[PDB]
Amino acid sequence: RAELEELEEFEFKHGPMSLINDAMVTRTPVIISLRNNHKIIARVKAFDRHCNMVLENVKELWTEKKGKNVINRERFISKLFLRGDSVIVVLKTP
Amino acid sequence: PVSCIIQNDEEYDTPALFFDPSLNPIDFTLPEDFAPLLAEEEELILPNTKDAMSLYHSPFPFNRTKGKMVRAQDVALAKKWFLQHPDEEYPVK
Amino acid sequence: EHTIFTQLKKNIPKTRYNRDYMLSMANIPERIINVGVIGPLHSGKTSLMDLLVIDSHKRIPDMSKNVELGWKPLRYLDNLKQEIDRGLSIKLNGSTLLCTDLESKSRMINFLDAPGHVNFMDETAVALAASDLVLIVIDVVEGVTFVVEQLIKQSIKNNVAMCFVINKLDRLILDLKLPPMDAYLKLNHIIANINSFTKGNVFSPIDNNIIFASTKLGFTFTIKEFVSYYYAHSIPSSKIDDFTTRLWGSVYYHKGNFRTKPFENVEKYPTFVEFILIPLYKIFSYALSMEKDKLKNLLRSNFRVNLSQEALQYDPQPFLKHVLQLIFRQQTGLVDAITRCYQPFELFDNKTAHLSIPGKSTPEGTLWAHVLKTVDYGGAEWSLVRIYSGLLKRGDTVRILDTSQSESREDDETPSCEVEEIGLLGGRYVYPVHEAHKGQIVLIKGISSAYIKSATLYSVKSKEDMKQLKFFKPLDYITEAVFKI
Amino acid sequence: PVNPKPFLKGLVNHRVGVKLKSTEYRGTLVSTDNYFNLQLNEAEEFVAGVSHGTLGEIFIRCNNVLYIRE
Amino acid sequence: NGIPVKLLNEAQGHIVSLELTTGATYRGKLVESEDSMNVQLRDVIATEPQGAVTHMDQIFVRGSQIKFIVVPDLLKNAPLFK
Amino acid sequence: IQVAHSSRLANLIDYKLRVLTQDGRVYIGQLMAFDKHMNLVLNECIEERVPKIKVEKRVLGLTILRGEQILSTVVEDKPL
Amino acid sequence: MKLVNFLKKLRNEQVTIELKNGTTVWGTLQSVSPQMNAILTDVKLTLPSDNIASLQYINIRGNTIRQIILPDSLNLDSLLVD
Amino acid sequence: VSTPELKKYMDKKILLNINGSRKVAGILRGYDIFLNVVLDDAMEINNHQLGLQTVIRGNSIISLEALDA
Amino acid sequence: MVPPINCIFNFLQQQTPVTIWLFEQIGIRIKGKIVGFDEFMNVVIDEAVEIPVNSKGTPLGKILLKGDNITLITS
RNA sequence: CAUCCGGGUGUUGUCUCCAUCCAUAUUUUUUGGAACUUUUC
């Protein structure tokens, strides 16, 4: 099990799960696109195989809107767990 | 059924399981540490098991390790002799 | 005087499995299978049945403390007083009880015990006109004998699925004292012998056409059903299909790795000898010789089995029987190997072709049942029937025809009788039932006066069907009389 | 002869575009894995063939992917 | 192993009802079931989500797309549970 | 409505259960048996649906319910 | 490595939970499964512009739970230790 | 783990009810443990055939209702 | 029986006109030639062509279409 | 048909001695194909 874990870690370091890891290490502000139209601008704390995330300094962005209407809303949250199926594309703004 | 039962009475030091002179002559792997269920106990023959296997075939009194008590005259010692045949050599007497 | 029978309903042994749930299974034709058990003398057939019943029923009034404990075999099927005294089976007697396979599906099964003595081959054939599949019970010691050869030939011949039981395995360890190696050689020499007679087919422990049992000590294990308890609690779910087939037959094992290699490395025992027999002997040898301290823990640490303080004190045999049954649970190994070996689309259509006109005409369209024998259950004469179509009921008037008549095949063809009662055959007792369905064998009171020996039973509202319904043949009996008094 | 995984491997440090379960993408591929999750640089968001925004350094989750293209 | 799976297996023979993700109820004799609820059924009616009904012979359904299965109430009695 | 303070689902076997599914239907009935994948056997199951107004009601009976479609379960009442 | 472990460690926390269908769920996490199946107590279901519905006990499934909104005070580094 | 018992439906024409309220027809030629279907080709339900033989993915199948008995 | 994997292999060997349908997407189809094979349904398909379905033709290059969103094959 | 030498189990009393269940994400379940907009009622 331990060996497997190690292998996984190595893979992450090497492949497409490296960037996220790096970000986590640095703890920079990052944005995430999500299935339900939620732009999650937040500070990453945890990371795993599934791309679930523990989040601090959380700032989501969406639009409560029953047509025709145009409103842009966003809320601050202190600490927030996140599920991975939601995640479409994570990004890092320098 | 025509009992085939076999035991050799001479050497107690012959094992319990033996092939008697009388008998006709007749891609992938599992994890290590996986073994038979009783593989941990090494020997399947024990010092008593010879005798125990013998007792397992006996007339009434001996095959049981538990029982009640009888009067001394309710034990029939000579009853077993005349139920079985006399053999031959004996005189008519 | 004639028989030892239970004539009061309050005294019928209560059944744990809830009879009325069994009556539900009677409708679905694919759910039930009728299986008769055949074999040579004293192979354990009747004492095999005696396992299924005691496991099925919660309390039985005919159990003495002596037959419960071990010493004397209970024989439920040998109801007749002659059979008790004669020490033998004369007339065939079955039971109808439901039992679950290993998958936990619950099927209703009708057993028929055939008498094994050569002279009673009348009722082995009466068991091959009912049994869908048969169990053939073989002694390991006596080997496969000539009268065994003729049974498998009659079964191959009569379109009946075969499954073998090699019984009386204590008589190998306890009587002969064969070492674990010498035992497996003889399990081959039999199983290797069995295949030769069976033309164009092979049996094997792995395919679950062969069952290993000893009925005196009361255990039956199928190498599939043995693994699912213990060795399947160890290694991952995906390897079991792979493991089991790697168990029997010449493959060896070193550490974690099956290698068909000659016997190389150091130790040599085949995979069967090491993973089955040797842990079987160690069960024996320890349940006799070892202390009740050492043994009590080894059952907990390995088999996940616990002996009560009562169990700790019995006697050598009654204790050994208690250890084996507590290791090998209520018997799903037999019920499984029976279930998967019966394919009705290879058979049920061919069998009826052998019992009557091949056809097929008058599809459905009639209540059509086959009357086998007139069987004496206590104080009355019943007819043992099998239903190939339609639904019998109490009070119906049905046409009945002898098989002396069907050699021939509008008014004048008609004897008629009511079907007055229909029971389920229970051994000691008979359980009342209002109706019957396709596939299940029952007992009718009131048909008996209309025939002798075999008969055909039909009820029809259509003249077209009346023309097209096929009548059964005179039943075959494997022997001819030849002995005159 | 050409399987998908090797093609993917080959296409590292090269331009790629991805459609989703929908919006097109366009960026240079950084690296890939067995699960087909992606990491890209110079990401441009083609909203039905309209580059809405240039995000830059991004990581695409595998299950939302539709196809890869040059 | 799953007890619902076992129940389903037991229900073999019986007339089960069966709705999918689509919302298209069926009712028929359960021919065969597997660990994955890959049901086959005989003599089966088929209701559309809107309303209309259609008779059909031997439907197969893949458990993935199955929503819920109704089994007859006789199976409640015995002897799978204990 | 009142109910005990359980740890798991398994420990609260045979309790009358409200059940929500992804489609929006509400199955109510006693949990006879659970699963590794949260499939539920329900003893006396009633599907209750709401068309786009007021509760439409259907009595089903003994129901095997697939966990994929299950959203969440709530306790409707005590045993018996 | 595992967030599952972290989740498990979070016990007896009065938390909001957010689903794939957007339902806001205020309750005390009594337990969570290895597969994120949340078991709440003292539960309060509200939608994202309509009235509230309260419940004593709710077992929500792991696939549904989008985002568990954590408590106010929490030492995360400590939690993250094996 | 277990094989989908579709040996009854082998070499018979089947209505493969498929994802997104669509349909397919055709005679059954093969399948696997994931319930992918290999079938000799037929139309998409007025009507128009595409292909000589066709392979349908496992996930996509709602139903495979038998046209022939 | 002809397994799906075998069929795929055959198709690959051939290099024939393959027309793929998309899972949960009626309006679009793909048309090309199979180049790759995977343990899952995923493949690489060079010279592909996106098609709007009849309720014309559109430009498209070489593509691997992911196994999860496949529906139909023909070759 | 009996007598006689003996026997099991249970209840109560009394007497003696002592003593207060897998570990992990790529088609059948839990890494979702979800959401947005509109009509009728």
Ligand SMILES: Nc1nc2c(ncn2[C@@H]2O[C@H](COP(=O)(O)OP(=O)(O)OP(=O)(O)O)[C@@H](O)[C@H]2O)c(=O)[nH]1
């Ligand atoms: N040593 C040994 N003896 C057994 C075993 N099983 C049965 N027997 C004995 O062998 C005889 C066979 O028992 P039955 O069941 O009455 O034989 P059967 O199969 O009914 O024989 P039929 O008269 O043909 O019905 C009995 O006297 C049992 O005591 C066994 O496993 N080991």
